[PDB]
């Protein structure tokens, strides 16, 4: 008797693990060596950002299994390796 | 049954200027970043005031150990976050509700640096942490701040960077008191043969520049660590796993995927 | 349960072992749960124990999963059990001099 | 992603509201939610491509839903009804217990055990018909 | 979908509705920079021209007639909306002259034309 | 963007025709990546605008949105009337496309009028 | 008779947008326009198109 509908635009979400960027506010003429990196791997910011407050919703956050951190720990290793280029490294190999 | 060789790569090394800028972290279409606006957030568990935004605030990638320079301040009170308190091997992050400014300079021995921090603003701000520490620890125990214990020079001293020069500040005269119920100087030594935090292996840099070297920052964080024995508690600081620097700024963010396609029963037809 | 023996003064090799060889943060504790060693990223951090300057680890082996504990100058007081904490695997090893 | 990236954030506006009051405002919101030097120019163009490699990504993510709605009969309709009978084996709850005391998130914790089966039944019901 | 798509604004609306449905060295080492930079301007114009089409297919979807060019509805005309004789506004009048006439009521037609679909959504 | 999948069988195409949408550091050459970043993005707006200009044709013939739509225009005998059994059995969609050459232009001309006849039929009841 | 709705109709109203300026410059001359016409300008349009209506 009761039939299946379809709706488009329902407020549902899951917990995914996508690959976000940085999009900082670099100047693209400086040589601060962050502005050399942030002009290449990071887009310009958004000047009128969107921020939607919500209703009575209690999300179960986490802080120690967050995966935005492994996409910040990569883009800073990949900053310092092209920013503070040293004179002598000594990285072990240790082949079995 | 294994043995390890150590390579030696040699790039061309100039003296590059180096200051961190605020870097956001936005996502592509089809996703969203929830944001916890609860100003008393433990770090885990259900956050009641969840908002929805694209990316977070300009997070400055400030690499440091034993402290968290130039970060962001708590809203009301000093927060204390850990994955499991009384695990004794988890680094207790601590935020500040006030900036503890720190002048740390090289005047006109080229590897010599004092580091001025006020004893008025520090003794108050270290006192606020002892309130928030006895909340989880019984309201009758003595809290003792030691200096460090062993390890490499990057984790036993407040190692940071300042205009390309790798400072190494001794903070023994910063955590020294023992708590019951004008300006300190810190002997920093610019080093040239450091350990890397990216991977395992040393790095050898150029000699430092000629001229004055200055960086005035806000200590807005701490990474303490308990030493659970068998009574008082000894809180010696630490750090080194650099994810914990950026964990303290991506702490109120979660990445979700919008799935707007619902199938509910009704009494329709056709 | 593993066990090892030493005489006096020598160097032992008490090893943890991970599963993936990609430098997971580990630790080492005694029976009374005081810290001995421990990875902190790619640095090294000792603990406020009696072995504060007589303990070490091979830094090149952390990328191959193995996190040894090397105790030089074995005295008589350090006869104990020692416990890894890699992710959850509290692999206990008892040492006697 | 200024074009159709702000639409996907506007879907999550009435989250945590009840199921009747959230589905009633779908028609209302979607009409409203759809509303250089020398060294610069070879870097300011990559800031123009990377702002279009995501803005186009907001288009072909939105059209990968209308290609999915168009398979199940109705395309372009937000609220749409279908000729497939709701089995009670999905959920054994009356409609008085559904559109009055539930939020939309609790459905993903209730029918996602079955939510790939419903998508197959919605396929053939507007395939042969 | 395009922006230079209808530059065929002729005279007869009856003919316009018929064609409504039928639709070397200048370089100086910088000619790869002229074609790259203005390549973006021809892409920021085409992508926005797509997102204007999708913004309008949702507006025609609220009126029920989505994905279709000539939408015939179930609501009559009035006397306030330039009550002509269907010969002066269909065979000798350009669309621009017709758009300038009913511009006072285009925001007023769109309100009730939404309601005429919601009544057709009540019998479902 | 909606491409194909290898062809190679007419009958096995129509089973897998649905599933293509039913479920789912250089800094040195800034002209090798900026020119080929536009040409690989001009080929992703065209793959969107060719979809919208081809849902516009199926909107004319009443087939808008449906992948496999069915319509009321009968087979003439003069459009290469082969065996209807072996068309789906052992044939690719390329080989069938050669089997009508210029009848595709006049197949489309009836579907524009048969809907307009159906436009003059549904409004004449 | 009845309200009908057309899409693709050739009409335009008016606008008050902010136009961007082209001004093909040289970028190395120290003249004060050629140092301004690279600050807030763009290369001029290669292969321009103009349709008569
Ligand atoms: C926390 O945040 C604060 C706020 O930003 C950070 O403090 C900033 O620190 C930077 C450097 O660490 C400092 O920048 C200097 O500002 C000076 C004032 O304008 C500049 O003159 C100076 O430039 C010189 O030094 C660079 C170092 O390499 C050179 O590359 C540059 O070309 C300049 O060099 C000239 O002078 C030197 C002598 O100094 C000489 O050797 C050269 O030959 C040449 O003649 C820097 O740009 C900011 O001013 C600080 N901010 C404030 C507000 O004061 C702090 O660093 C952050 N904390 C951490 C840990 O990062
Ligand atoms: C936090 O860590 C501590 C220390 O590892 C855990 O406490 C001990 O857990 C072991 C499990 O092997 C028990 O045998 C001990 O009895 C526990 N001791 C105490 C004093 O509790 C504790 O369980 C951890 N907390 C959480 C939530 O995981
Ligand atoms: C860091 O500073 C502390 C003191 O600020 C040093 O610790 C000892 O300090 C006393 C005086 O307070 C000296 O007499 C000792 O010689 C110091 N050393 C020892 C081993 O006791 C500490 O040594 C400093 N750290 C480093 C690496 O030099
Ligand atoms: C939050 O909960 C209260 C309690 O019933 C309810 O009245 C209110 O409508 C809820 N908020 C929203 C936005 O629905
Ligand atoms: C943090 O606080 C929450 C309550 O908000 C509690 O449920 C959780 O167990 C706490 N976690 C820790 C590690 O103390
Ligand atoms: C720091 O403050 C505490 C209490 O406010 C006080 O007991 C102590 O003497 C102070 N120390 C200094 C050096 O001012
Ligand atoms: C510590 O203080 C708080 C508030 O001052 C109080 O509620 C709590 O009971 C105290 N803890 C004790 C007495 O163990
Ligand atoms: C800590 O303090 C003790 C005594 O004040 C000193 O011997 C030791 O060297 C200090 N260690 C560090 C790392 O400051
Ligand atoms: C320190 O904090 C103040 C506000 O409390 C801020 O204005 C200043 O910029 C901060 N210093 C930094 C970020 O170096
Ligand atoms: C232009 O006007 C002339 C004269 O009225 C007419 O013959 C011709 O068909 C018109 N052409 C167009 C394209 O409107």
Swiss-Prot record, chain C:
Tissue-wise expression: Highly expressed in T-helper cells. The presence of CD4 is a hallmark of T-helper cells which are specialized in the activation and growth of cytotoxic T-cells, regulation of B cells, or activation of phagocytes. CD4 is also present in other immune cells such as macrophages, dendritic cells or NK cells.
The keyword ATP-binding is assigned to this record: no
- Its main subcellular localisation, reduced to a broad class, is membrane
Q: Where in the cell is it found?
A: Cell membrane
The alphabetized UniProt keywords are: Adaptive immunity, Cell membrane, Disulfide bond, Glycoprotein, Host cell receptor for virus entry, Host-virus interaction, Immunity, Immunoglobulin domain, Lipoprotein, Membrane, Palmitate, Phosphoprotein, Receptor, Repeat, Signal, Transmembrane, Transmembrane helix
Q: Which residues pair up as cystines?
A: 16-84
Name any Gene Ontology BP term: positive regulation of ERK1 and ERK2 cascade
Alphabetical GO CC annotations of the entry are: clathrin-coated endocytic vesicle membrane; early endosome; endoplasmic reticulum lumen; endoplasmic reticulum membrane; external side of plasma membrane; membrane raft; plasma membrane; T cell receptor complex
PTM summary: Palmitoylation and association with LCK contribute to the enrichment of CD4 in lipid rafts.
What does the record give under GO molecular function? coreceptor activity; enzyme binding; extracellular matrix structural constituent; identical protein binding; immunoglobulin binding; interleukin-16 binding; interleukin-16 receptor activity; lipid binding
* Domain comment, as recorded: The Ig-like V-type domain mediates the interaction with MHCII.
Q: What disease association does UniProt give?
A: Immunodeficiency 79: An autosomal recessive disorder characterized by childhood onset of recurrent and recalcitrant skin warts due to uncontrolled viral infection with human papillomavirus (HPV). Some patients may also have recurrent respiratory infections. Laboratory studies show a complete absence of CD4+ T cells.
Q: What function does this protein fulfil?
A: Integral membrane glycoprotein that plays an essential role in the immune response and serves multiple functions in responses against both external and internal offenses. In T-cells, functions primarily as a coreceptor for MHC class II molecule:peptide complex. The antigens presented by class II peptides are derived from extracellular proteins while class I peptides are derived from cytosolic proteins. Interacts simultaneously with the T-cell receptor (TCR) and the MHC class II presented by antigen presenting cells (APCs). (Microbial infection) Primary receptor for human immunodeficiency virus-1 (HIV-1). Down-regulated by HIV-1 Vpu. Acts as a receptor for Human Herpes virus 7/HHV-7.
Protein's UniProt name = T-cell surface glycoprotein CD4
Instruction: Record the organism.
Output: Homo sapiens (Human)
What gene codes for this chain? CD4
Question: Which stretch of the full sequence is covered here?
Answer: 26 to 122 of 458
